[model samples]
Target: LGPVTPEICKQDIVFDGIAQIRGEIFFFKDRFIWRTVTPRDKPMGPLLVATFWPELPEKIDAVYEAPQEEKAVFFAGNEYWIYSASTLERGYPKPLTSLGLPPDVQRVDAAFNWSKNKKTYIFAGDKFWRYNEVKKKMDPGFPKLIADAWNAIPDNLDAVVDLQGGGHSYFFKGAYYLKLENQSLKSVKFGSIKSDWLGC
Candidate 1:
């Protein structure tokens, strides 16, 4: 038999949300605080959710930084809130259906903007849907199996983000993160998620 794949336990660094803005990386949990990947930054956060979005839900399921726009999208439950990354203008949270997603897509597990294709991919469970950023609609024949497009990247990812100008994307699932190589996705054994940020 080959090496056994390990399961994520409660003690693992399971990220709830991840995003990139202005070349900086931010990770979040439902407890209304965020952590950064900056050197010596020491996870500086405990930011108030109310300060970012008044009356917003306490738990955020995922976050995506739109490369073509000045805003970031925060997902929780069946709705999403738009925040201006540059100006910090918070927009009202709206249902996923309002954004042309299928009514059954009640919660988003992960999201990322594919700048090269000018599309946004939202993943939930084993499937994913493609959204046209400019036309603002879901592309038909989507909701494809995650295994099909992502290869070795498992379903129900905790978070995802495009590497800034790196022509690559990262998928976070439980204790590990996968790097999307050309037509393949694989785990990096040389580093841990915390070490990548904390430098410990």
Candidate 2:
């Protein structure tokens, strides 16, 4: 291993949120948006809330892309908005109740679309529930503890995304991100999330 570069060590560009869609990585902050592309690139301005989706709230709690559908969901304050992943068609933000969540469940900490298992899981606090996309309801006998399914991952994750190519998944919390592959877990600095893919 070599000494970390200044660019990678600088905390100014730290990712507040992250998501993967259609093989692309989208790192989001309240005002900034950075996406992965070719090595040759130009500087881009901060992303405007109104320009992307006028209906989306100013603050985003989390984001997840549906594995089977061409849609992405944005969550904030017990509400969520759905938009076309390809076209960015804005849809009305709905309450957690719409997803069969209890009224007391105020926020979501993380979410993941398990395409191989054909299920979507939402984590809040120490428990997580499975949502059936086709039936539009929460599966019974859920709300399981974080340790039950995810052994090494912490109870509350800052963000999560399924890498979508080899059953690899990432769990992020603060300055570190954990990788879950083939039932094994490994932890690395947050900058590795970008460097591993973009070679920065």
Candidate 3:
């Protein structure tokens, strides 16, 4: 049987802001282990599970056996902190001590890519950068110009579907996917809904 908790459903879903799942489960050292998501926010972000371990009691105890009142789903936020299911509390983000980053690289957007041949991790920010694990230094010369190019689209552009980056390279503006590709972008697919499902 599954653990019971407060009603896990929500309504009044809006178009602004987003709640995404960023965690996962896996094994470590021949034992099941769970890890929280990366780039977690401290003051108001979602709780991400990076790994899952089934054999370990501690790993599965609170996850599967906790009372309904004590368990809740995690959510990611735009703020700089991560939030927890319990207390809905937020915490500070871990520092980039290992990255040896300079103060100039202040902001960052990250994503994990498992694409064939392009199986690598990406971190995009103001300058469009990525972490090179082996070199231990950020690839400073990333395609920073592309992001800028997309931002330069003029308002008078005609209606044209921007079919780039798997159709997610746009934003919601007046009920339209603001094409980020060419400056002449105008129209695109609408009413795309993403959801969350926790299997029992």
Candidate 4:
């Protein structure tokens, strides 16, 4: 390996807003996007959020692709934007309460679809809220403590991505990650996102 440039050096440090399209998973850090078709290969940073979704904000707190809706969701501050491919949907960049989150929620840590079940989960701080993709409403009895639901993973995770349509997924917190299969209560593998998954 040769000496790394300063710009590319920041590539592997990316965290949160894990989005996916078909077989490929995506990472968003500093308004830029990155991904790997093969984990062993170096990441291919896609275009910036401005170039990809021009109307979106420069600072995104979290992002996810809603399975049933087939739309990209970008979270910023207390609001969110919706897009299809590069086009921003009309009447978006709406408030968090638009998704039924409480007005008290200032921001989100991360979000992801339970691919197998077709439900979306939003995380912020120690609590998590669930959304029904089919019902198009926030499910009741949520804002559950992450500690109570899954002790195997930590709270306020950076991001979560379902590798495939199966239940297999990865949970990222800082540079570390935990992989769980079938969404069971157990994690099968744990490693660093910089070295192991991103191959920086």
Using lDDT as the measure, the top candidate is 4
Model 3 scores a TM of: 0.31
lDDT of 4 by residue, 60-105 (tens): 8787888767788888889999887878888998999999999999
**Candidate 4, overall lDDT?**
0.77
Give every collision pair in model 1: none
State each model's CA lDDT, in order.
0.70, 0.66, 0.27, 0.77
- Residue 132, candidate 1: how far off, in angstroms? 0.9
Residue range with the least summed lDDT across 10 consecutive positions in model 4: 2-11
Model 1 error, position 22 (Å): 3.6
TM-scores for all candidates: the values are 0.80, 0.78, 0.31, 0.88
Candidate 2 — which residues are off by over 4 angstroms? Answer: 1-9, 12-16, 37-46, 86-91, 182-200
The best candidate in terms of TM-score:
4
Window of ten residues with lowest summed lDDT in model 3:
59-68
For every candidate in turn, the CA RMSD to the true structure comes to: 7.5, 6.2, 14.2, 3.3
- Greater lDDT among 1 and 2 belongs to 1
Error of 4 at 157 (Å): 0.9
Candidate 2 lDDT over residue span 1-200, tens digit each: 95442242334354545667566666566645555542113223345545766766666767778777757777778998778843554445778878888888988887777655768888887889899987878999988898876757788777777765666677777666676663444433233544453344
Task: Estimate candidate 2's alpha-carbon lDDT, on a 0 to 1 scale.
Answer: 0.66
Residue-level lDDT tens digits of model 3 in 1-200: 95432221232212222222233221111112222232121112122223221112221111111111222221122222222442333343323323444445443333222111222222333333344534545566553442453354323221111111233333322223343332333443343221211110
